[PDB]
Design an enzyme around this catalytic site. Structure first.
Site, PDB file in Angstrom:
ATOM      1  N   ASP B   7       0.887  -1.189   0.000  1.00  0.00           N
ATOM      2  CA  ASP B   7       0.000   0.000   0.000  1.00  0.00           C
ATOM      3  C   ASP B   7       0.915   1.226   0.000  1.00  0.00           C
ATOM      4  O   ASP B   7       1.542   1.487   1.042  1.00  0.00           O
ATOM      5  CB  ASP B   7      -0.975  -0.016   1.181  1.00  0.00           C
ATOM      6  N   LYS B  69       2.466  11.416  -3.719  1.00  0.00           N
ATOM      7  CA  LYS B  69       1.302  10.707  -4.325  1.00  0.00           C
ATOM      8  C   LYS B  69       0.313  11.720  -4.919  1.00  0.00           C
ATOM      9  O   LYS B  69      -0.458  11.334  -5.819  1.00  0.00           O
ATOM     10  CB  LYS B  69       0.606   9.819  -3.293  1.00  0.00           C
ATOM     11  N   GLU B 174      -7.046   0.223  -4.754  1.00  0.00           N
ATOM     12  CA  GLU B 174      -7.016   0.136  -3.270  1.00  0.00           C
ATOM     13  C   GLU B 174      -8.319  -0.463  -2.737  1.00  0.00           C
ATOM     14  O   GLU B 174      -8.269  -1.350  -1.889  1.00  0.00           O
ATOM     15  CB  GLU B 174      -6.683   1.503  -2.671  1.00  0.00           C
ATOM     16  N   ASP B 197     -13.228   4.238   1.063  1.00  0.00           N
ATOM     17  CA  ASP B 197     -11.751   4.260   1.206  1.00  0.00           C
ATOM     18  C   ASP B 197     -11.277   5.714   1.254  1.00  0.00           C
ATOM     19  O   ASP B 197     -11.044   6.295   0.182  1.00  0.00           O
ATOM     20  CB  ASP B 197     -11.102   3.479   0.062  1.00  0.00           C
TER      21      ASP B 197
END
Ligand SMILES: *P(=O)(O)OC[C@H]1O[C@@H](n2cnc3c(N)ncnc32)[C@H](O)[C@@H]1O
Ligand SMILES: [Mg+2]
Lengths: 340, 522
Positions: B7, B69, B174, B197
């Site tokens: 992750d 990210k 994810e 999420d």
């Protein structure tokens, strides 16, 4: 692919449960992971057969056996569907034959047939050039051929393609349709000489000397064209070919010629003319592959490239039925009743 | 060797391994099961990654890098990039229209990094964490991305993996990873699950139908620039404004002051998930003066209420896309660190009319857990049985046609991998080229959609305008990444059409250099 195997195993489990929509998704996923997955092709064939889609089931069994000729389950399945598909395909030919006879049953006192046949002629030129990307409208094509006047703000090439088609069709109908004897390489060259004559008078009526591509299809090297064309015309004039249903004969004639692609250009226009020469000699009206069918046309040609020409034969059969249906609708006479 | 599941989160990253039929989430050298997505360069030239990097943020903020990210696969111009810059202590500079990071690497020697190189360092630390546990080198990984990641963001994550010396065997969405973590041990047959999420920087909602090892994404919708980072920015901005109102001192000048506030805002936000107020205390905050303020849960909620409420829209969207009722949802699975926020749990629970979320799902570890399982499957030697993912593309893909028209080829929520072909033609006589402009979005005009890439198609043979039949093919692979191909459908010479890759993404030569640069710290 272990991934492909997992997807097929789940496809079979979901099918067992009656989750057919999910099973179909999982079959399709397995064949994305491994397009040549023989167990998946065979089991997806069974899935089609359960839904009474015998042609698709047989297509998948046949495709499986082209990859793995000794595959036990595919062999058994194909041996079951082979006669069922022959029955289905032959039944469609019988329906087409009935509709040809219906067109010939049109009384000679029918006023609509004469004008419809004339209109259909110009429709045929439109569709055969348009399917190849020619942008000329039906009305523009009628103007070019009836008047001989050049349409303003349009390429000489596109107009010369249409003039060439008109010349080719006039030659076929007046010299070849009613002629007794074998159809020769020289005849095909004479057709091509008119098809390409006004666009490319150098290449018109002679085989290419260079390698060409036909979409995704790689045709023979130019040095092999003469020999393959000799083998082609031998098949054309064979008792085997003469014993085929005219629709299958005409479709295979079309495919065999574009497979060779003996010309630098005009292979499709020439092949569609030869297809209609065969149908008209067999007493069928000439058929049209419509501009709108371009994508379907390329798909079934690619299917033929991959080793099964039957989707192409069935496509040509459906074009034939559509032509007949349109001719019969267009010439329908609406009866006048006494009130009584 | 062993394929690991990583992750790669905005704020934290997590690595798992599937061995002897179970997942191990691996603790780093400091004993932590999650690792900060932070890198730093000491004045002495030591590359710090993870806890060591984050823990010296307040004393070396200019040369501490994070939030990569939310920079990867974006333009410099991106309003979202410009938003983050205001709260990032490190120099973000425009290089080839993209946001690169400029830091002092030591000895007055400045280096400019692609965001991919920062993420590569984080992936290197997660790999090293796994290697320390396994006692053997790690060469292969499954790396997660937000479901709503666009093509450029996916490729950038793959590129980060390549630069870290990892064979990225698969990019996994994810929420799909989270679904595997939830569903693996369950043998309950067909269930509809809503995965919500909300992580450090990205928000996804995925509606899945899970069924005895089959994980089917029905619909996905999210925001790749909404998460914990935004909640921290709202609180930081509140207290920077309050300080200028109280003292008159604008503290945006002092990077140490701003990043001291960031560190204490993170602690306060975490506290406010179990208590109703938190004290924010900083000694020598600005010009040697102290900071002392209380943040109430109510004030934290007020500052973020628009953002919190906005998370309900993708839940509504996936239900609409799936044509499912709220009642059709069997399980609500909360994942990402930000789902610990009481108000987030409350909004989701009230949306689903009091339905409690699934128990025994660690929101910090579930994504890594699922990645580790898929890594085990692709490893091929872990006896994982018939686990099948049927995932989808998040965005409609189209080609710009004459008039700036979005000609749609692949709709959003199409199962991948997928192929779509369409025949196009030229706009002028003897046109030898297509400028293929691929867009991501729903709008009928491409100016209102997102440019995925520009592809030069050359070798169209001379012909009148509108005559050539140039088939253009979109292929989305199992990673959710686009390949563009083309074929002349007509009769032509032996010389096929050529498409040149987009020149505005990292070339093999650029990646080779970044790989070689990374290897020096091995
Ligand atoms: P050229 O313009 O000379 O011929 C075009 C015709 O070729 C045929 N064709 C298209 N695509 C295929 C494939 N894949 N295989 C075989 N023949 C093909 C069509 O008849 C075109 O009209
Ligand atoms: Mg041609």
């Amino acid at each position: 692919s272990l991934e492909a195997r997992a997807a097929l195993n789940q496809a079979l489990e979901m099918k067992r449960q009656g989750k057919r929509e999910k099973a179909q998704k999982l079959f399709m996923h397995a064949l994305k992971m491994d397009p040549d997955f023989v167990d998946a092709l065979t089991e997806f064939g069974i899935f089609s057969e359960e839904d009474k889609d015998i042609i698709q089931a047989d297509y998948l069994y046949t495709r499986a056996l082209t990859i793995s000729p000794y595959h036990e389950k595919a062999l058994v399945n194909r041996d079951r569907t082979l006669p069922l598909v022959e029955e289905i395909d032959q039944r469609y030919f019988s329906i087409i034959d009935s509709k040809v006879k219906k067109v010939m049953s049109i009384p000679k006192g029918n006023s609509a047939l004469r004008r419809v046949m004339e209109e259909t002629y110009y429709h045929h030129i439109y569709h055969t050039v348009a399917i190849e990307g020619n942008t000329l409208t039906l009305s523009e094509i009628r103007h070019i051929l009836e008047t001989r006047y050049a349409v303003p703000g349009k390429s000489d090439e596109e107009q010369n393609e249409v003039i060439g088609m008109h010349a080719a069709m006039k030659y076929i109908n007046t010299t070849l349709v009613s002629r007794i004897g074998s159809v020769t390489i020289s005849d095909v060259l004479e057709i091509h000489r008119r098809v390409l004559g006004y666009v490319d008078p150098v290449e018109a009526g002679r085989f290419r000397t260079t390698q060409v591509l036909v979409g995704h299809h790689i045709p023979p090297h130019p040095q092999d064209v003469e020999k393959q064309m000799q083998e082609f015309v031998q098949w054309l004039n064979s008792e085997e070919a003469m014993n085929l249903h005219p629709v299958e004969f005409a479709a295979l004639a079309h495919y065999k010629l574009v497979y060779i692609a003996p010309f630098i250009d005009g292979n499709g226009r020439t092949s569609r003319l030869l297809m209609n020469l065969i149908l008209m000699q067999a007493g069928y009206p000439p058929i049209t592959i419509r501009k709108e069918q371009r994508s379907d046309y390329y798909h079934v040609l690619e299917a033929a490239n991959e080793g099964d020409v039957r989707p192409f034969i069935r496509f040509i059969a459906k074009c034939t039925e559509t032509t007949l249906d349109t001719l019969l609708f267009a010439t329908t006479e609406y009866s006048v009743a006494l009130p009584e | 060797g062993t394929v690991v599941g990583i992750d790669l989160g905005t704020t934290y990253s997590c690595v798992g391994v599937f061995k002897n039929g179970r997942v191990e989430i691996i603790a780093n050298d400091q004993g932590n099961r999650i690792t900060p997505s932070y890198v730093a360069f000491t004045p002495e030239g030591e590359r710090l990654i993870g806890d060591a990097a984050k823990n010296q943020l307040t004393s070396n903020p200019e040369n501490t890098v994070f939030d990569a990210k939310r920079l990867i696969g974006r333009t410099w111009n991106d309003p979202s990039v410009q938003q983050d810059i205001k709260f990032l202590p490190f120099k973000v500079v425009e290089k080839k229209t993209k946001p690169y990071i400029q830091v002092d690497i030591g000895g007055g020697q400045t280096k400019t990094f692609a965001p991919e190189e920062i993420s590569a360092m984080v992936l290197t630390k997660m790999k090293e964490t796994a290697e320390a546990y396994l006692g053997k080198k790690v060469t292969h990984a499954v790396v997660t991305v937000p479901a709503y990641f666009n093509d450029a963001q996916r490729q950038a994550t793959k590129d980060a993996g390549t630069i870290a010396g990892l064979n990225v065997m698969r990019i996994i969405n994810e929420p799909t990873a989270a679904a595997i973590a939830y569903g693996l041990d369950k043998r309950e047959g067909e269930k509809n699950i809503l995965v919500f999420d909300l992580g450090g920087g990205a928000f996804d909602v995925s509606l899945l139908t899970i069924d005895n090892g089959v994980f089917e994404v029905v619909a996905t919708n999210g925001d790749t620039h909404l998460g914990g980072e935004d909640f921290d920015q709202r609180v930081m901005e509140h207290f920077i404004k309050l300080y200028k109102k109280k003292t008159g001192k604008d503290v945006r000048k002092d990077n140490r002051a701003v990043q001291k506030l960031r560190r204490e805002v993170e602690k306060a936000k975490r506290a406010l998930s179990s208590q109703h107020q938190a004290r924010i205390e900083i000694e020598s905050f600005f010009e040697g003066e102290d900071f002392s303020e209380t943040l109430t849960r109510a004030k934290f909620e007020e500052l973020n209420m628009d953002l919190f409420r906005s998370t309900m829209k993708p839940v509504q969207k996936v239900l609409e896309d799936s044509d499912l009722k709220k009642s059709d949802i069997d399980e609500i699975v909360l994942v990402g660190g930000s789902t610990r926020i009481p108000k987030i749990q409350q909004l989701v629970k009230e949306f689903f009319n009091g339905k409690e979320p699934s128990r025994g799902i660690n929101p910090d570890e579930a994504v890594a857990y699922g990645a580790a399982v898929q890594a085990g499957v692709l490893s091929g030697d872990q006896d994982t049985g018939d686990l099948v993912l049927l995932d989808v593309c998040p965005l409609t893909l189209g080609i710009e046609t004459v008039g700036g028209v979005m000609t749609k080829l692949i709709p959003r929520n199409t199962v991948v991998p997928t192929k779509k072909s369409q025949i196009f033609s030229t706009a002028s006589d003897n046109q030898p080229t297509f400028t293929i402009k691929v867009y991501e979005g729903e709008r009928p005009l491409t100016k209102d959609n997102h440019l995925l890439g520009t592809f030069d198609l050359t070798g169209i043979p001379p012909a009148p305008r509108g005559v050539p039949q140039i088939e253009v093919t979109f292929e989305i692979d199992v990673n959710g990444i686009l390949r563009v191909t083309a074929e002349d459908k007509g009769t032509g010479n032996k010389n096929k059409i050529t498409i040149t890759n987009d020149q505005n993404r990292l070339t093999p030569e650029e990646i080779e250099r970044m790989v070689n640069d990374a290897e020096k710290f091995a």
